[PDB]
Chains A and B, each alone.
Chain A
C-alpha cells in the first residue's frame, strides 16, 4: 500500500507450469510463499502470519520497472503499461510492449546418466528492468526480503537463478493515490486474487479477468515425498472489476498434511 520494493534479478526462472518455459513476472503467491519459507527458517512465520492475516498486510505481484513502475494491461476498456501511460491506454492508441526480459532457453545435462537432458528457460532482464512488489512497509517484511536477496526467487535458485538486489523505495504519487482495497467503481486487481464465495458471486458478473491456474507442488520438510497442491484457479494481474472485492489466503494443503499451504490471493486494487 505504502512502499514499493525493487527486485533486480539479471537471472530468473519463474516457472509457468514447466521447466521448459519461464515468465517475466511472478504472481504474488510465489513471493508470499518465499517469505513463508524464509520465515519458517529463522523461525518467525508465526509473527509473519499474525501480520499477514491482517488487513494491513497487502502484497502484490511483480510488474516490470524500467525507470518507473509498470502496471498490467487492464483487460478490457481499450503486456504492460508504465503508470504515465495507463490514462492514455484507457483512451488507447498504441503501447506496444518493449523488451524487459529476453526469455532464453538452455539445454542442460546430467552426465553419464540415462534420461538426463532437461531444458531450463530463463528470463534474462535487460540491464535496467526490475520487478517491484508493492507491500505495506513493515520491518518484519524488510528482514524477510533482505534475505530473499540472497536466497533468490522462483526457479532453480540453487543453480543460480532468481537472485536479486532489494532497493526499497517510496511509491511515486498518482500510483499511491490509486491503491484502494475498498472502492466501489471501475477497479483493477494488480494481484492474482481469489474472492470470498458470496463476494465471488458479486465478482463474476462484470469482471474482465483471466484465470491462469496457480498449482503444482508443496515444498515441505515433513513428508519425504512430494505431494501435489490443491490446484487453485485464481484471477489475473489484469482483471478489471466493478465494486472491489475481498480475497482469501486459500489453504491448499494436500489433504491429510502436517502443515498449511497458504497460497496468498487477496487483492490490492487500482482505480480507473
Chain B
C-alpha cells in the first residue's frame, strides 16, 4: 500500500508546479518546476520522481492523459443556454464574501498566486506523507488551488479548476493501479474504470415523518437532514476506505447520490455487492425499510469519456438502470423471511418511527433508539466536529456511530468531519470537510416576537421559505450538452457544477444570512427550508435569488414559496402549507416567488425590480411624507384592488379624485402624483400591476402595524 499512497501523492501533487510557474513567472516545464520545488519543500523520493516524469510514474502519465479529457478559470456556466465570465483567483473562505465571477475579471493576476504559492509552501513543508494525511492534502488543496485555471494555454474552455483536475488525476491513477494490480496506448480501449453510484431512497420521507403534536419539531428536521447527510457521506467514505481507495475517488455526495470512479478489478464488484448487503442489513436492523441504499455501477473505458456526447450519457444510464432495478427488486429472500417471522408482543410504539426494537422514553410518552439518538444529536449539532466512534450512539454504519464532540480529546474516533470551519483552519489528523447550511440565530419561539423593529411597527408573524432550483436533475442529465455538438458534459465539468451547487447552497447560504434573524434548517440545492422573521425572510429570499443570478450567469434560476404563520403554529403544519406554495410557484413557466397565499405567485423578474423596490418604495415614500391619509385609505385601496370589476375602476376614480380635494393644498400635489400612479397601475391593461400593487400594499400594511 506504500506504493499505492506514493502513487496517490505523486498523482495529486502532480502539476502543482503550474501554480509555481504562474506565480513568479518561470519559463521551463511545470513538471520540472513542481518537482524541484517539491524536493526543496519536503522529503519524498518516489513522489518527486513521479512528479518529474509524468509527461509508478507511468500510471500518473496515463491518469493525467485521462483526466485532461493565458486566461483565468472561466466558470462552469458558459456551457448552458448561451448568454462568458472569468474568476479572480482567490481562496475559498467559508466565512467571507462569495466570489461572483464578473465578466470583466480576465487579467494576468500574478499577485494572488504569490499568496497561493507561499501558502502551499507554508502548510505543506512540515508535512508527513502517511496514509492518514491524504485528507488534509485534499481539503487544503480545495482551499488554495480552487478558483485557479487547470490548463490555460490551449484555446479550450477552461471551466475545470486545478483542484478538480488534480483530484481526478489522483482518481484515475488509483483506479488504474487497482486494475493493473488485478491483471499484473492501447489501454484507452480497455474497459478499466467503473463509475459506481448509489441512491439513498427515503431521504425526503425520513425527515418529514413528524406530527402536528411533536414536542420539538424544527430541531428534529435539522437533525434528521444533517443525519442523512452524514449517512451518505459515511457510505461514501466507508465504501472508499473499506475498499483500497480514499476520497477524490468521488464526485459529489449532495442528495442521496454519490458518483465514484472505482475500477473493475473483478473485486470491486464483489465488495460493492457485499457492502450493499451489509449496509442494507444495517438499515433493516435500525430503520425497517424506511430508507434503502442501492448501488449501481457502469463500467467504461478511457477512450469512452474523451464519444463524449453519446457515451457518458450511456454509462450514466447504465449505472442508473442497475440502481432502478435494485430500487424495484428490494431484497433477497433471506432478509424477508427474517422480517416476517417475528414473535413480537408489543404494546407500545415509537410515536415518530412507529418502530419496536428498544424503547426507553425521552419525553412524556415513549421514544425509539434512533429517535432518542436524534434527540441527543439535535443538541450536539451546535458543536463543530462530528466524530465517527464505535458504539457511541446515533449510528450511521454497521460498526460505527456518530456524535457531535465539542472539540475534545479522550474520545475514540475514526473521522472528524469539520463542517463550518474552513477547508483548513483547525484540521486534525483524520478530518474531512462537510458542507452544512446551518446558520442559527435566536430560537424559533423568538422569531415571532422579534419581528418588531424595537420601534413598535411590525406584525408578529413568522415566515417560512421553501425555495429550490427549478430543475437540478435535468441539468445533471443534459445541462451541459446544450451547446456544441452535444459536447462539454464531461465528468470534470459535472463534478465542478455539483460542487459549486453544493458549495453555494450550503456554505454561501450562511453568508447570505450572516445577520437577518432566521434559522436555515436544511439547505441542499434540491431544497432549502428557512424559518425566520418575515421582514428578514423576504430579504433573505430576495438576497439569495439575486446572489444566485449573480451566480450561474442568470441560468438555472430558483423558485421560492414564502408562507406567513402566526405564533407557535406547529412546524408540521407549517412545512406543508409552504410546500403547497412552492409547488404553486413551480406551477407556471419557469420560476416564481409565490408569496403568502396560493395566489400572489409573482415571477421573480416582476417582483424585486417591480414590487420590492419599485412599488413598495413609492408607497413608502408617499405614506411617510404625509400626515392625513392613514391605514383607512390603504385598506380601501386594497379592497378596491381585491374586488376589481370595471365599476370599481369608476369607484376608484371617484374616490381618489374626491380625496384629492380633501388634502391641505400644500399636500395636494404629492397626493396628485400618487393618485396618478395608483390610477395608472390600477387600469394598466397589463393585468400584472394590479396584483403587484395589492401585494405591495399588503407589505406596507404589514410594516406599519402596531
A interface, CB within 8 angstroms of B: 17-18, 20, 75-76, 107, 115, 117-119, 194, 197, 200-201, 204, 207-211, 213, 215-216, 225-228, 230-233, 250, 254-256
For residue A201, which residues in chain B have a CB less than 8 angstroms away from its CB?
333
Given A118-B212, A204-B332, A208-B328: A231 touches B345 (CB 8 Å cut-off): no
- Are B344 and A255 in touch, CB under 8 angstroms? yes
Given A75-B328, A216-B354: A107 touches B342 (CB 8 Å cut-off): no
Min distance, Cβ A133 to any Cβ of chain B, angstroms: 24
3 nearest A-B residue pairs (beta carbon)? A228-B346, A255-B343, A255-B345
For residue B339, which residues in chain A have a CB less than 8 angstroms away from its CB?
231, 233
Min distance, Cβ B123 to any Cβ of chain A, angstroms: 51
B348 closest partner in A (C-beta): A228
- Are B345 and A227 in touch, CB under 8 angstroms? yes
A197 closest partner in B (C-beta): B337
Q: Which of B289, B331, B346 has the most CB of A within 10 A?
A: B346
- Are A117 and B212 in touch, CB under 8 angstroms? yes
Q: Which of A213, A228, A256 has the most CB of B within 10 A?
A: A228
Q: How distant is the Cα of A186 from the Cα of B333 in the complex, in angstroms?
A: 21
B213 at the interface (CB under 8 A from A): yes
Min distance, Cβ A145 to any Cβ of chain B, angstroms: 29
A216 closest partner in B (C-beta): B354
A234 closest partner in B (C-beta): B340
- Are A200 and B212 in touch, CB under 8 angstroms? no
B204 at the interface (CB under 8 A from A): no
- Are B328 and A118 in touch, CB under 8 angstroms? no
Which of B211, B330, B342, B344 touches A211 (beta carbons < 8 Å)? B330
Min distance, Cβ A74 to any Cβ of chain B, angstroms: 11
For residue B343, which residues in chain A have a CB less than 8 angstroms away from its CB?
230, 255
For residue A118, which residues in chain B have a CB less than 8 angstroms away from its CB?
212-213
Given A208-B328, A227-B346, A254-B345: A115 touches B213 (CB 8 Å cut-off): yes
- Are A228 and B340 in touch, CB under 8 angstroms? no
- Are B344 and A228 in touch, CB under 8 angstroms? yes
Q: How distant is the Cα of A168 from the Cα of B542 in the complex, in angstroms?
A: 58
For residue B356, which residues in chain A have a CB less than 8 angstroms away from its CB?
228, 231
- Are B344 and A233 in touch, CB under 8 angstroms? no
For residue B336, which residues in chain A have a CB less than 8 angstroms away from its CB?
200, 204, 233
B237 at the interface (CB under 8 A from A): no
Q: How distant is the Cα of A250 from the Cα of B573 in the complex, in angstroms?
A: 37
20 pairs of residues in contact across A and B, judged by CB atoms under 8 Å: A107-B212, A117-B212, A117-B570, A118-B212, A119-B211, A119-B212, A194-B340, A200-B333, A204-B333, A207-B329, A209-B330, A210-B328, A211-B289, A215-B354, A228-B344, A231-B288, A232-B340, A233-B289, A250-B340, A254-B344
> What 1/0 mask marks residues of chain B from 304 to 344 whose CB sits below 8 Å from any chain A CB?
00000000000000000000000011111100110110111
Min distance, Cβ B575 to any Cβ of chain A, angstroms: 12
Q: How distant is the Cα of A54 from the Cα of B477 in the complex, in angstroms?
A: 52
Q: How distant is the Cα of A118 from the Cα of B572 in the complex, in angstroms?
A: 12
For residue B354, which residues in chain A have a CB less than 8 angstroms away from its CB?
17, 215-216
Q: How distant is the Cα of A83 from the Cα of B337 in the complex, in angstroms?
A: 34
A239 closest partner in B (C-beta): B328
For residue A227, which residues in chain B have a CB less than 8 angstroms away from its CB?
345-347
- Are B573 and A119 in touch, CB under 8 angstroms? yes
Q: Which of B328, B333, B356 has the most CB of A within 10 A?
A: B328
- Are B347 and A228 in touch, CB under 8 angstroms? yes
Given A216-B354, A228-B356: A209 touches B328 (CB 8 Å cut-off): yes
B364 closest partner in A (C-beta): A115
For residue B570, which residues in chain A have a CB less than 8 angstroms away from its CB?
117
For residue B526, which residues in chain A have a CB less than 8 angstroms away from its CB?
none
For residue B330, which residues in chain A have a CB less than 8 angstroms away from its CB?
209-211
Q: How distant is the Cα of A201 from the Cα of B333 in the complex, in angstroms?
A: 6
Given A17-B354, A117-B213, A118-B212: A231 touches B333 (CB 8 Å cut-off): no
B337 closest partner in A (C-beta): A197
Min distance, Cβ B175 to any Cβ of chain A, angstroms: 33
A115 closest partner in B (C-beta): B213
A203 closest partner in B (C-beta): B333
B39 at the interface (CB under 8 A from A): no
Given A119-B573, A204-B333, A208-B328: A20 touches B347 (CB 8 Å cut-off): no
For residue B333, which residues in chain A have a CB less than 8 angstroms away from its CB?
200-201, 204
Q: How distant is the Cα of A256 from the Cα of B328 in the complex, in angstroms?
A: 36
- Are B573 and A107 in touch, CB under 8 angstroms? yes
> What 1/0 mask marks residues of chain B from 415 to 438 whose CB sits below 8 Å from any chain A CB?
000000000000000000000000
B349 at the interface (CB under 8 A from A): yes
Q: How distant is the Cα of A46 from the Cα of B572 in the complex, in angstroms?
A: 45
Min distance, Cβ A229 to any Cβ of chain B, angstroms: 9
A194 closest partner in B (C-beta): B340
For residue B345, which residues in chain A have a CB less than 8 angstroms away from its CB?
227, 254-256
- Are A230 and B329 in touch, CB under 8 angstroms? no
Min distance, Cβ B285 to any Cβ of chain A, angstroms: 14
Q: How distant is the Cα of A222 from the Cα of B339 in the complex, in angstroms?
A: 27
- Are A20 and B328 in touch, CB under 8 angstroms? no
Which of B212, B328, B332, B344 touches A231 (beta carbons < 8 Å)? B344
For residue A210, which residues in chain B have a CB less than 8 angstroms away from its CB?
328, 330
- Are A228 and B328 in touch, CB under 8 angstroms? no
For residue B288, which residues in chain A have a CB less than 8 angstroms away from its CB?
213, 231
Q: How distant is the Cα of A137 from the Cα of B211 in the complex, in angstroms?
A: 42
- Are B349 and A228 in touch, CB under 8 angstroms? yes
- Are A225 and B289 in touch, CB under 8 angstroms? no
Q: How distant is the Cα of A201 from the Cα of B331 in the complex, in angstroms?
A: 11
For residue B344, which residues in chain A have a CB less than 8 angstroms away from its CB?
228, 230-231, 254-255
Q: How distant is the Cα of A232 from the Cα of B572 in the complex, in angstroms?
A: 28
Q: How distant is the Cα of A228 from the Cα of B347 in the complex, in angstroms?
A: 6
User: 7 additional contacts, CB 8 Å, given A197-B337, A228-B346, A254-B346?
Assistant: A115-B213, A117-B212, A208-B328, A215-B354, A228-B344, A228-B356, A254-B344
Q: How distant is the Cα of A216 from the Cα of B348 in the complex, in angstroms?
A: 11
Of residues 263 through 321 on chain B, the ones whose CB sits less than 8 Å from some CB of chain A are 288-289
Q: How distant is the Cα of A197 from the Cα of B328 in the complex, in angstroms?
A: 20
- Are A226 and B347 in touch, CB under 8 angstroms? yes
Min distance, Cβ A225 to any Cβ of chain B, angstroms: 7
For residue B332, which residues in chain A have a CB less than 8 angstroms away from its CB?
204
For residue A228, which residues in chain B have a CB less than 8 angstroms away from its CB?
344, 346-347, 349, 356
- Are B211 and A231 in touch, CB under 8 angstroms? no
For residue A254, which residues in chain B have a CB less than 8 angstroms away from its CB?
344-346
For residue B329, which residues in chain A have a CB less than 8 angstroms away from its CB?
204, 207-209
Min distance, Cβ A213 to any Cβ of chain B, angstroms: 6
Q: How distant is the Cα of A194 from the Cα of B339 in the complex, in angstroms?
A: 12
A21 closest partner in B (C-beta): B209
- Are B347 and A231 in touch, CB under 8 angstroms? no
> What 1/0 mask marks residues of chain B from 440 to 468 whose CB sits below 8 Å from any chain A CB?
00000000000000000000000000000
Q: How distant is the Cα of A216 from the Cα of B353 in the complex, in angstroms?
A: 12
- Are B289 and A230 in touch, CB under 8 angstroms? no
- Are B328 and A225 in touch, CB under 8 angstroms? no
Min distance, Cβ A165 to any Cβ of chain B, angstroms: 32
Min distance, Cβ B17 to any Cβ of chain A, angstroms: 52
> What 1/0 mask marks residues of chain B from 223 to 242 whose CB sits below 8 Å from any chain A CB?
00000000000000000000
Q: How distant is the Cα of A70 from the Cα of B652 in the complex, in angstroms?
A: 54
- Are A225 and B342 in touch, CB under 8 angstroms? no
Min distance, Cβ B221 to any Cβ of chain A, angstroms: 15
Min distance, Cβ B103 to any Cβ of chain A, angstroms: 42
For residue A76, which residues in chain B have a CB less than 8 angstroms away from its CB?
328
> What 1/0 mask marks residues of chain B from 204 to 225 whose CB sits below 8 Å from any chain A CB?
0000000111000000000000
For residue A225, which residues in chain B have a CB less than 8 angstroms away from its CB?
347
Q: How distant is the Cα of A215 from the Cα of B290 in the complex, in angstroms?
A: 14
Min distance, Cβ A258 to any Cβ of chain B, angstroms: 13
Min distance, Cβ B334 to any Cβ of chain A, angstroms: 10
Q: How distant is the Cα of A13 from the Cα of B347 in the complex, in angstroms?
A: 24
> What 1/0 mask marks residues of chain B from 547 to 575 whose CB sits below 8 Å from any chain A CB?
00000000000000000000000101100
Q: How distant is the Cα of A232 from the Cα of B343 in the complex, in angstroms?
A: 12
